[PDB]
Design an enzyme around this catalytic site. Structure first.
Site, PDB file in Angstrom:
ATOM      1  N   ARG A  10      56.073  82.716 -32.294  1.00 26.76           N
ATOM      2  CA  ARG A  10      56.395  82.428 -33.689  1.00 26.76           C
ATOM      3  C   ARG A  10      56.822  83.681 -34.435  1.00 26.76           C
ATOM      4  O   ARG A  10      57.752  83.633 -35.245  1.00 26.76           O
ATOM      5  CB  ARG A  10      55.187  81.780 -34.376  1.00 26.76           C
ATOM      6  CG  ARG A  10      55.405  81.409 -35.835  1.00 26.76           C
ATOM      7  CD  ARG A  10      56.041  80.043 -35.965  1.00 26.76           C
ATOM      8  NE  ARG A  10      55.174  78.989 -35.453  1.00 26.76           N
ATOM      9  CZ  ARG A  10      54.513  78.116 -36.207  1.00 26.76           C
ATOM     10  NH1 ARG A  10      54.619  78.123 -37.529  1.00 26.76           N
ATOM     11  NH2 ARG A  10      53.733  77.214 -35.617  1.00 26.76           N
ATOM     12  N   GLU A  82      51.589  77.169 -22.370  1.00 30.62           N
ATOM     13  CA  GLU A  82      52.786  76.353 -22.203  1.00 30.62           C
ATOM     14  C   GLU A  82      53.504  76.695 -20.905  1.00 30.62           C
ATOM     15  O   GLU A  82      53.941  75.793 -20.171  1.00 30.62           O
ATOM     16  CB  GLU A  82      53.690  76.535 -23.430  1.00 30.62           C
ATOM     17  CG  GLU A  82      53.101  75.886 -24.695  1.00 30.62           C
ATOM     18  CD  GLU A  82      53.869  76.185 -25.974  1.00 30.62           C
ATOM     19  OE1 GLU A  82      54.687  77.133 -26.006  1.00 30.62           O
ATOM     20  OE2 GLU A  82      53.654  75.442 -26.960  1.00 30.62           O
TER      21      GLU A  82
HETATM   22  N1  LIG Z   1      44.535  73.819 -36.716  1.00 31.57           N
HETATM   23  C1  LIG Z   1      45.700  74.525 -37.160  1.00 31.57           C
HETATM   24  N2  LIG Z   1      46.706  73.933 -37.819  1.00 31.57           N
HETATM   25  C2  LIG Z   1      47.775  74.607 -38.224  1.00 31.57           C
HETATM   26  N3  LIG Z   1      47.907  75.912 -38.016  1.00 31.57           N
HETATM   27  C3  LIG Z   1      46.885  76.565 -37.339  1.00 31.57           C
HETATM   28  C4  LIG Z   1      45.782  75.919 -36.896  1.00 31.57           C
HETATM   29  N4  LIG Z   1      44.955  76.824 -36.253  1.00 31.57           N
HETATM   30  C5  LIG Z   1      45.567  78.006 -36.337  1.00 31.57           C
HETATM   31  N5  LIG Z   1      46.742  77.854 -36.991  1.00 31.57           N
HETATM   32  C6  LIG Z   1      47.762  78.858 -37.328  1.00 31.57           C
HETATM   33  O1  LIG Z   1      48.587  79.047 -36.204  1.00 31.57           O
HETATM   34  C7  LIG Z   1      48.628  80.472 -35.989  1.00 31.57           C
HETATM   35  C8  LIG Z   1      48.619  80.707 -34.504  1.00 31.57           C
HETATM   36  O2  LIG Z   1      49.880  80.180 -34.079  1.00 31.57           O
HETATM   37  P1  LIG Z   1      50.961  81.357 -33.716  1.00 31.57           P
HETATM   38  O3  LIG Z   1      50.260  82.637 -33.488  1.00 31.57           O
HETATM   39  O4  LIG Z   1      52.019  81.454 -34.813  1.00 31.57           O
HETATM   40  O5  LIG Z   1      51.514  80.949 -32.326  1.00 31.57           O
HETATM   41  P2  LIG Z   1      52.189  81.790 -31.176  1.00 31.57           P
HETATM   42  O6  LIG Z   1      53.420  82.467 -31.584  1.00 31.57           O
HETATM   43  O7  LIG Z   1      51.225  82.659 -30.443  1.00 31.57           O
HETATM   44  O8  LIG Z   1      52.495  80.527 -30.256  1.00 31.57           O
HETATM   45  C9  LIG Z   1      53.608  79.650 -30.576  1.00 31.57           C
HETATM   46  C10 LIG Z   1      53.905  78.844 -29.337  1.00 31.57           C
HETATM   47  O9  LIG Z   1      52.716  78.075 -29.031  1.00 31.57           O
HETATM   48  C11 LIG Z   1      52.905  76.823 -29.621  1.00 31.57           C
HETATM   49  N6  LIG Z   1      51.852  76.559 -30.766  1.00 31.57           N
HETATM   50  C12 LIG Z   1      51.979  75.421 -31.495  1.00 31.57           C
HETATM   51  C13 LIG Z   1      51.028  75.043 -32.464  1.00 31.57           C
HETATM   52  C14 LIG Z   1      49.910  75.908 -32.639  1.00 31.57           C
HETATM   53  C15 LIG Z   1      48.894  75.602 -33.606  1.00 31.57           C
HETATM   54  I1  LIG Z   1      49.065  73.853 -34.770  1.00 31.57           I
HETATM   55  C16 LIG Z   1      47.811  76.473 -33.770  1.00 31.57           C
HETATM   56  C17 LIG Z   1      47.679  77.632 -32.985  1.00 31.57           C
HETATM   57  C18 LIG Z   1      48.686  77.951 -32.037  1.00 31.57           C
HETATM   58  C19 LIG Z   1      49.807  77.072 -31.870  1.00 31.57           C
HETATM   59  C20 LIG Z   1      50.814  77.388 -30.885  1.00 31.57           C
HETATM   60  C21 LIG Z   1      54.358  76.587 -30.049  1.00 31.57           C
HETATM   61  O10 LIG Z   1      54.758  75.368 -29.404  1.00 31.57           O
HETATM   62  C22 LIG Z   1      55.050  77.851 -29.542  1.00 31.57           C
HETATM   63  O11 LIG Z   1      55.795  77.612 -28.348  1.00 31.57           O
HETATM   64  C23 LIG Z   1      47.385  81.098 -36.586  1.00 31.57           C
HETATM   65  O12 LIG Z   1      47.686  82.425 -37.009  1.00 31.57           O
HETATM   66  C24 LIG Z   1      47.124  80.183 -37.769  1.00 31.57           C
HETATM   67  O13 LIG Z   1      47.778  80.687 -38.933  1.00 31.57           O
END
Ligand SMILES: Nc1ncnc2c1ncn2[C@@H]1O[C@H](COP(=O)(O)OP(=O)(O)OC[C@H]2O[C@@H]([n+]3ccc4c(I)cccc4c3)[C@H](O)[C@@H]2O)[C@@H](O)[C@H]1O
Length: 140
Positions: A10, A82
């Site tokens: 992301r 993934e």
């Molecule tokens: N319950 C919750 N609802 C909403 N937001 C929440 C949350 N808990 C935590 N956060 C937030 O999400 C962030 C972590 O996500 P990110 O760090 O940006 O992800 P990455 O870049 O590492 O990975 C990106 C890759 O994994 C997949 N993906 C898709 C959806 C995901 C979700 I929904 C949560 C966590 C990881 C995900 C990873 C996607 O398909 C792609 O291919 C934290 O900082 C929180 O602000």
């Protein structure tokens, strides 16, 4: 159900991931990217199911995109999760290289080292139409 799952980091590959989604949809593919198609429920189960459902797995290798996979042997990193799902399921994995440096395999957990053995497509800012056309040829 989607033909193509887009996996990306992301904080560095979101724009390219979105651009790939737009182009592939214009060419008739059903595309999963989390911000458009991940809906309600426990996201761990839903994401893994969505990787399983898609024949094609498009992996956006922006700079350092696999850094958080390194030493993630408990598989808590989501790009790691993934990739392991796509490898296990025998998906058609299509890496997209946008500034990615090819690492030595041994810096990655063993369960995802095989991702580096798939032929990757170089993203060309100067020749985007040709890049997209090559991606479409790689998809099943
Ligand atoms: N319950 C919750 N609802 C909403 N937001 C929440 C949350 N808990 C935590 N956060 C937030 O999400 C962030 C972590 O996500 P990110 O760090 O940006 O992800 P990455 O870049 O590492 O990975 C990106 C890759 O994994 C997949 N993906 C898709 C959806 C995901 C979700 I929904 C949560 C966590 C990881 C995900 C990873 C996607 O398909 C792609 O291919 C934290 O900082 C929180 O602000």
């Amino acid at each position: 159900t989607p033909d193509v799952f887009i996996s990306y980091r992301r904080n560095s590959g979101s724009q390219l991931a979105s651009l790939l989604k737009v182009h592939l949809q214009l060419h008739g593919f059903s595309v999963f990217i989390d911000v458009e198609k991940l809906e309600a429920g426990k996201f761990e189960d839903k994401l893994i199911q969505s990787v399983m459902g898609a024949r094609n797995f498009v992996l956006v290798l922006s700079p350092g995109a696999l850094d958080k996979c390194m030493q993630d042997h408990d598989c808590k990193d989501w790009v790691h999760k993934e990739i392991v799902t796509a490898l296990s399921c025998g998906k058609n994995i299509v890496p997209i290289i946008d500034g990615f440096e090819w690492p030595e395999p041994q810096v990655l957990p063993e369960d995802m080292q095989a991702v580096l053995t798939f032929n990757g497509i170089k993203w060309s800012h100067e020749y985007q139409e040709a890049t997209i056309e090559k991606i479409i040829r790689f998809l099943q």
